[PDB]
Symmetry: D2
């Protein structure tokens, strides 16, 4: 098994951690800013997903989980982290403060072969959205690897399907999310930019300049949605579009993409592990070409499972 390390224990760090403790590899370390007592608690009790299906026990310099030992490091400098020291092949980077390669390469300085960013990268070797472009992963070329963002992860797979089947002329989109970002979240809809359409240039390059978007932050706890109005190149029906997605979910994108025929609300998708959950009842078609598709996604649960999917894959290509 291959030793992995999580760096930072924010929300993503925690969720990733949670579903990671899987066969293909093993988490042997966390570098965090919180004392064993506190990590301990965070792992076990969840504000959004409930309570920990496993077991947890706190100690001075390390942690135990299901009898699995985890050393606890507190260093804000990756240069000084002991990977090669600790047998650490791959670093999962959840701090969000080293998102740039120049600054992320320090994990490799310090004895780690690979860094996987749980956010969008700067000057990274590659960006991989699982279910879409993963063939593009070249193990001998790439060291710092981006998982993109959770919106990109929802958008790319959806947009991919449309384009393969019906072709994409162009499209506009709105990510309804759970500068102006300064402002109080609780009383407001907050409009803003999104990078997730610009990110497509990285994982789906034929689609360059074809899609643009924006975000609306709203005061809802967990589940977000992508609202996508695209024009296609050939005649389609509500029916034909929904069946593309029905097909693919039983198919190539099983576990990446879900089709929901059923009338649910955003919180029904709490703790769903797909990147995109197509809301079948909201598919619209105008003039046989113009297409609206709504896709739900959990902001953390889905994303983090694609992080473990990616980590699994890298671990697999080192072997």
């Amino acid at each position: 098994m291959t030793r992995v390390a999580i760096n930072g224990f924010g929300r993503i760090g925690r969720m990733v951690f949670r579903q990671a403790i899987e066969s293909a590899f093993e988490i042997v370390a966390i570098n965090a800013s919180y004392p064993s007592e506190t990590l301990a608690h965070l792992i076990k009790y969840d504000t959004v997903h409930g309570k920990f299906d496993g077991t947890v026990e706190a100690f001075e310099d390390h942690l135990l989980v299901d009898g699995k030992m985890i050393r606890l490091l507190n260093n804000r400098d990756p240069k000084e982290l002991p990977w090669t020291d600790l047998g650490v092949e791959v670093v999962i980077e959840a701090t969000g403060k080293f998102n740039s390669k120049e600054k992320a390469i320090l994990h490799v300085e310090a004895g780690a072969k690979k860094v996987i960013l749980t956010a969008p990268g700067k000057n990274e070797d590659v960006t991989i959205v699982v279910g879409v472009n993963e063939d593009q992963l070249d193990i001998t070329k790439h060291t710092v690897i981006s998982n993109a963002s959770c919106t990109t992860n929802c958008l790319a797979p959806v947009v991919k399907v449309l384009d393969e089947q019906f072709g994409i002329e162009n499209g506009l989109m709105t990510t309804v999310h759970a500068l102006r970002r300064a402002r109080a979240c609780g009383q407001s809809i907050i409009p803003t930019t999104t990078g997730a359409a610009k990110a497509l240039a990285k994982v789906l390059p034929h689609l360059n300049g074809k899609l643009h978007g924006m975000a609306l932050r709203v005061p809802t706890p967990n589940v977000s949605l992508v609202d996508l109005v695209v024009d296609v190149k050939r005649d389609v029906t509500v029916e034909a579009i929904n069946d593309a997605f029905k097909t693919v979910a039983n198919g190539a994108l099983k576990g990446i993409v879900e089709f929901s025929e059923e009338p649910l609300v955003s919180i029904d998708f709490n703790t769903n592990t797909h990147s995109a959950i197509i809301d079948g009842l909201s598919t619209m078609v105008m003039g046989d070409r113009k297409v609206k598709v709504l896709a739900w996604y959990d902001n953390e649960w889905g994303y983090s499972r694609r992080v473990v999917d990616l980590v699994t894959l890298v671990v697999d290509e080192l072997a």
Copy 2:
């Protein structure tokens, strides 16, 4: 001074009242509500959203007072028995939402009222009027039971008009994002997808546009301001500046005070208590492929709307004389 009454005292009725008392062109006389005098007074005075009432109120067994004026109160569940001919009231603003069917709302008429105005999309109604749009299709002689449609339609109809007239419209899909079936579920923690009638309502006020616009809604747990987010294909080449300019011009012009263009990076709460039917978010306008166009329209789903209601009520008042 034309004598008018408000049936029902929901948020609409309350909010209409608030700025209606403050309109001179007609005078408010009566009301009908299930609320006791002390209660109604409080309701006028304190508001969670728009803040404290500008003015002064006082409370009595069967009547009120506001800012120097006498208002009668009734509790009559039934329109017919409603004592209209007596208090001598021409026009009944129907805000209860129980009487939006022509027949139902024709009782006010029978009971001595002339013309009656629905603060909601009406059924089998003589006429639906969105102000800034078709307010011209109102013939006082032909129409008695009149609807002001829904506040969403009042945001969407003006935007869609400016685009149609200027660039022509091909197709559109709108999503509406509503501040507070699937509707049975608890909306506090949820984004609730649902249907909207605002796109089909256009058939009533903008008939050349039938079948061109369809849409849906998203209810979010936000207190007041809502938005319409529209994606249309237009009939000729446009840009961001061109679109945005069309809205600036019209907000200085013929749509003055109906439609507003905002250039700033604001957030939904900032349009709180705003009186425009549609507030265009200028930084949000986008154009793809020269044809496809995103527009964002903020609207306060109580305040803007209930201003058009005063508006609609005073036209009828300015007719009916003539």
Copy 3:
């Protein structure tokens, strides 16, 4: 025996969900204004508690292969209890909390009415874990389960009374004219009857306790914040131990003692009437105690209904 739920609001919904995992009785019928396809859904999918087999039909349902009949009526006297052979009716609309109203059920052929709210002139009020032994099947027909707040306060306030004795109390309940206003923005101060009601389940505590409610914008979990002066010297450890004991003891399953540091949403889908927040307990000058108890205002209370319903059924059976 055969039980009917009148009303299918949030309360009736949770009761029903809880009942189905019970052998003691079987819910045969629901009266309510919803369509079956909707009713199916409300059941099948829960906003707060997560998720549930089900299927629908014009006039009836199938939950776990079991036939639930669906009525839609607003007058109870005209419901077919006798026809349906329903002995006990769970009154969850809370339109009928007055008794002279709650009886229409009795005239429609139902033996016993169980109010999921405080009664008005009810034959008795029952808080399970406190006064249930005061239930007399002979004399008592319309029976009130009190409120979810009364079900938190009463098991906590007696444990305190028996062990240390109570002198005085003021309390605040923090709930998830003034009532009318939007709950979404504000803290809404309002009245509570939960203190007044002890006078019907713990009469010795009469006018020793008063209270008020703070309505706050949170989805499910509520808390009671109680400041009592007791009759003898205590310590935080003394008080917290009374609860730990009672939670393994007579009040097991009704009351629970939580030692870990948690927030309200942690107590979601918890069946207990009161969950003591052991890290919040305070003592001032030996006699003045602060206790904080969480309660799921739906789940817990609901389970206390299935417990009351269960009791009454057994009692009839004898």
Copy 4:
């Protein structure tokens, strides 16, 4: 006439500013923030909770115009490095939250400023003032770094002061319901109980009450109004009417403008942009056993406090001149 400067532009600095600029007794001539003028401008202009700024604001490169008054902008993370000397700056309102030690706060003085005022409770500060309570215990010659405590302490202390003067206090417990380990957790869903320093703090402002009161906090997701729920035992016999009169009297009196008595059936949002330290919710006063008393006091946990800051800043200014 006395040039004042705000250091930091968060909710508090901003709210303080918004209120200060409208004050005659003294002058806001500079702001030190990490933010570029265009944003400061937008932040003063548009307020999410309190609404839109009553007035006018223009952003320029190195400064602003606010109600036609020139406010110099600074961005230097180093108090030592600020030209309080050249700008003629006597008092510095310190709102960043980072300089709350006296070790740190004193710099603004090393940099040429007479007095510093912390918009939080102080760590090893010279003095802590709650206006309406301990004001006159300010000593200009011996006190350099002054603390205005927290918003809660500011609610608790006038209230507790009132009850004690009239009825005497034996014992108290309290709960603060706060708007906006356990603090770690996600806030939008839950009632989060936590600790509160508001009761210890009374040790600095009303020392004789030391040991008599303790409290806790309950954080709930509401925009901006907070409350103090107080259960206290008094030394002598009271009625609901007696208590409520003590506050009615005080509010027309010694505490006018600090303490309000609300008789009306109101909810928390009705007190938004109220300037008082505590608003007594008169319909919630209870008395059990003639002795045990419950009082509820609302406070706007930005706007009231902010105003106190300006009251305290005003007070400092009026001494320097008294020299």
